[PDB]
Symmetry: D2
Subunit: 392 residues, 4 copies
Amino acid sequence: MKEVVIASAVRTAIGSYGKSLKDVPAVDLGATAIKEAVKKAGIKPEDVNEVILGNVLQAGLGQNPARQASFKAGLPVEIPAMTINKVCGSGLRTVSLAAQIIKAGDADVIIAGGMENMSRAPYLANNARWGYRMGNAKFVDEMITDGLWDAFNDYHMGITAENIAERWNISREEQDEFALASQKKAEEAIKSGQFKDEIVPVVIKGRKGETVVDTDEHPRFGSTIEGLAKLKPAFKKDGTVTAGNASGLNDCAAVLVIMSAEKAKELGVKPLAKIVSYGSAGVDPAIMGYGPFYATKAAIEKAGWTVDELDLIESNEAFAAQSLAVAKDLKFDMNKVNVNGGAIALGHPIGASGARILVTLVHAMQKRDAKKGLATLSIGGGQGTAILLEKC
Amino acid sequence: MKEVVIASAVRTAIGSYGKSLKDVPAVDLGATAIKEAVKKAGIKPEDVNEVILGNVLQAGLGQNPARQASFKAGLPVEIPAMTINKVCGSGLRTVSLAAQIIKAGDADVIIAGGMENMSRAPYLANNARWGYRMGNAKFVDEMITDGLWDAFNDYHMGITAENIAERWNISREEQDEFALASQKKAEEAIKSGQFKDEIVPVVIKGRKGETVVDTDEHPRFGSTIEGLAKLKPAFKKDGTVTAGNASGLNDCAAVLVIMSAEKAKELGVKPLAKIVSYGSAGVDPAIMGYGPFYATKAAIEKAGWTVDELDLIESNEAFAAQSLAVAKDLKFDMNKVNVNGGAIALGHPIGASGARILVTLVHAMQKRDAKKGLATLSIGGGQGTAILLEKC
Amino acid sequence: MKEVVIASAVRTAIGSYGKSLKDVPAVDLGATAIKEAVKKAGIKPEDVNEVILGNVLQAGLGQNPARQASFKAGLPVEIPAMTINKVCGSGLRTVSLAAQIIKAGDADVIIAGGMENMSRAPYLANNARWGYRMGNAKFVDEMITDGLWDAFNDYHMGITAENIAERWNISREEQDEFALASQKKAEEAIKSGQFKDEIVPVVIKGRKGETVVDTDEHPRFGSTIEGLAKLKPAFKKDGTVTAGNASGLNDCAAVLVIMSAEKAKELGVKPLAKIVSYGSAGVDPAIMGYGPFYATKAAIEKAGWTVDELDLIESNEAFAAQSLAVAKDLKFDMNKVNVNGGAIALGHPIGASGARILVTLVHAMQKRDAKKGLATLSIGGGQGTAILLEKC
Amino acid sequence: MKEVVIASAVRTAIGSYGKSLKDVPAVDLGATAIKEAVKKAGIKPEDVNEVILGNVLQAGLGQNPARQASFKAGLPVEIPAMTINKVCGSGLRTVSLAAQIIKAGDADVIIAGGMENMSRAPYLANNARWGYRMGNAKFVDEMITDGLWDAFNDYHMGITAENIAERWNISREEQDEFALASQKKAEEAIKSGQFKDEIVPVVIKGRKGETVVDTDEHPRFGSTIEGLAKLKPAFKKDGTVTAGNASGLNDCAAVLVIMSAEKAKELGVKPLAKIVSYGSAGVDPAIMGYGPFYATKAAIEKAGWTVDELDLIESNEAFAAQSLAVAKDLKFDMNKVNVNGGAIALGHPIGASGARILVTLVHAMQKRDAKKGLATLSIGGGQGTAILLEKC
């Protein structure tokens, strides 16, 4: 079938909760990233066949957030658009969907990725339409309910991370040392300019002129193991998961131009990487963090690779406990994993996250001349998605 | 490419706003439909490779409503699921997506369709997280915001219908006469059993007994042109669009088992219809109701067909103005269009509607021994989707 | 001191929760009652010196609900008004307040009483101004919070009633038998016209016609002991208090013109009754239902009277447990207590209830040619109020 | 009749909106002030006959805020309590009510004043009980609706201030110079310790120990006429009322022990002042700010005084425009008015305000040996209350 390539890969900076991007809707973050992805790919907007974007906290964002990002990016109205929700999987899944659509023969150029603004999530009154009748009710945190809460087990994704910590015996200390390592690598990557190629600035029109956001603000520079050790468990009494060893609540968009190799050649595009294979998998909701194990193994099988053949891995860090369990079971060389930091440091903008680590992966591959790459991440409700890349 | 077939096609009854399905979440409607779809295909839950469902008003429904429907239907945890939002296109677009993933070589059996419960949509407070500070604010009707409001022109879908009535010179009388015929056809179809095969019952089991819902309650039996002519305009002073010549706000799930022809043969399945081609297109948001013109033309071209070749046509009735504009410009034989009634009578459960019309089209094709069929509908934000079926 | 008299005494019908008065704000109920009170006293609006009304659930009713009732009743702007909240005592305490201000030499004519619409109470978000930050919160039922919940012990008024059933050893049977007699007396009183004089009609004039409300709808005609015995406990596992032996959640206004004897004589008024003495007392919040014991004893002492001297008694029926405890300890002849029914039948519109029972007592005194009367009721937070009347 | 005296007069500091007292409920501010008023009066809690406290934004504060302040102050439960709402009038009106009750012969010792926490006011959903049905609705700022909004004219109290500015020709410049003078006097009074006798500290138990609030934080020290002149109108295009010439939204409690002179002598109390007379009056809502003119003139008549006989005046400053119109018409010597600053500087905690200026007045009278004093203030909905004091 057709070969599928990444023509460009761009993200906004990742903002912290209620901070740098609090005033920028997800659709606007998306539009910004789309405009720049298309420029960087060296194609025209008229060349784009479809827009397929991840977004989880869609509540009150208005009809079809992907369509809104497309329109605001100034793409032609004739182009179809759809919004995909697979929780954290969403931004990665839109890229393998783009690959599938190209392999099916129905398109040659797709805008894919995702966008999230967790700072802007509303609160909900679920029975305001027909009435509460009597009695106190819940004023619902939509970010938690739609993004962070297991629908089957009625607890936080944080408890799924404790379950993996308990089952695998991943200790608090181990979780903290991985978090520390992620912090240090993200500081070194930011300060050394590793992310300059991939970040599109966001311009915020305020009262007095404008301000530019172009740097990932979530990392805690000069983090220490003592500092991490003082934190209290965040999710349960006497637990192991804290604020310091889990990611935050974050805002971002990450967008990729995906194309058939044939069209890329026809338009003079110099692709970054070939998408070699992909796969998604389900696991018990109760241990959703382990989803990447099974998605990765299936993707590696399809590609005819081994884990040891990989040059660079992005394995998301929603929680140290789940990253460490995946890492342990797939036997990753940890020196090749999240070489520029992971989500404990950088943030976890759920519907963008899977696209964000793919953007990070492909740019690291280009900069470091690393031939073979994997991107993978866990999904609430018990799933995983993985993609394999080979550099052009 | 592999050939792609519809193995089964099931829907719940369509409920009216605040009425027969008000106490049934979209994900439970979804699960009832899935469970019965699998049964009717003559396959086992284990035979399903993926679950792709439409759902527009996801607010507060929790993580990945498709996954929740899957799980509640008794489908294995290993099966990946994702939720699609293409506004009213959602339930139809999941089906062409399924065909694309099977054509790509990645699955053999997929649960597709959509689900919606508009009666259950919440109200939102957009600034409760960080605070209002001072002054009255909007308590936001999420159903309107996320389902029925144009994000770009800041007006209701109903104004887009008026734009089309104005630009195409479609009169109030033309719209009422179209609405009356839909009501007439719907009454006759219900009474003569046309929908009995396709409708799975919904059992509502409250604290003290049970209630079976298995009939479409939205039709107004004994409708008259005089009744319709008396109605007040719904969207603007002196408008042509009314409650009587537009659909309602409705609750439904509609689900299809989609398979490769090869796998259907391997599993002993007698498929209902082959998916011959499909397509989506965009159009000015202000005249979104015309999306089906461009989408139908693209699908017809791809299939090698003509409009005159078509035996049965499901062209959705969100508003009579848009159904009429589409039907005039495509030169449909209206004797072959919505033969069992359309959404003005039956309802328009947005995320499910696209799947609903396809379920209705394929059962009508089987019953009437009709070879070639077309399902298409308009999409808020200026889009349309179309699928062409050929009877097995 | 000046002698203080009741010139007129009027009330609306008492509506049931979510029923006949749901569309009538408390301040409009108030104005209808005021307008008719002035008329029935045979005075002019200009003769009124002040407006003092009870109202408990003031949330979102706007500035000074008493003033709004005054203005809407057609009373002059020069007349001062204030709104009193003594929970259920409010409507009775405004009357003793009026007597006190006239005794002080500061007015001759005062509009007193109370008003409530519990059906219309809002829900609240307590942290929307400065923000929730994260997590589900309480969507607060303001009717419960401000009207029915003990601020000190963090439980419903219904638990205070259970405390009294327990400490006084008042059985479920005693409570049901008391409730049945109230229902029996209420039916007989309505049917024989006992309330026709005191009730002013409420005209509801909507978009398309009108609806007169002029009958107390809360009574359950044909009540039986078997019916009552079957009921589930309302407040606690194995409780004695039920929906059948407690009052409801109700809507009413009740207003009295209070004057000096001197001014009534100057203006040609034939007063209904003299206010002989009054008093309020406190008690442990946990047994608030017993407040009327201490308040009645204080008022009786002040008047120079005895309980045995009383001809008619209005002792409110918020809960049968508390009515029974009070009546046992004061040794009331129950043949003389709530002769036309009590609140278990009629309803308990909290801010108006104290005025309601006084309106009912004085009309009963006039009709039955009864010389000495007593109105008293319990107050959430552990209080009681009592007024003693002597027929003119 | 009995002579009525002020035995003590105490207030909390006045906090700014969302600032120093944001975490202290009104009832807690009240309890603090009550405890200290009783100590300073040199009586026992058992000597107190009734509690009568002003509070306007009662929404969700729970049953009978006055009762809650009483209980939390540790006053005996046998003592009756009630909450009074006359908008800004409330805290002053409770003192003349206390006087009336004493003159009536029903009590000898009353706790009076008021409390407000505008920072803590909720938002409201008025139709959550029985349902919105469809459509966006208002998420209501309860502080604005219940405290700051005319119920008859459907605009802010700010527009009533513009109406007085326009009718009387009080210019922006004049309004600003009065505001400047109020600022300077409040700075001088705070820095010179004028308020030390009257302020009770509020202790806030936080995470790390506690913090004390004991100073009025609203004043803007080093205010200038240029700074005031730069502000934009706050209420209407091209208006005269700004943030700098109107008071804020503020938090406070102010409480007084009111007694008959006879009881004061019997208990060894050294009273501060005699309450000579009082009066309230109504005016058109549209010019509510002028209410004090008519209340003051009536109070002066009753006392047989003249305005020129007054030594000290507290005339509230909700808006410079209304203070100036009252001042002009009653011909006040402005050197004797608000000698320690007014509400433009100090704040306007609505339900406490009338008590706050009385506390300020009586302490200034004692400190400056000023024999005759007036306290007066405007009330939304078109009223005024005034009290005359003569020093013991």
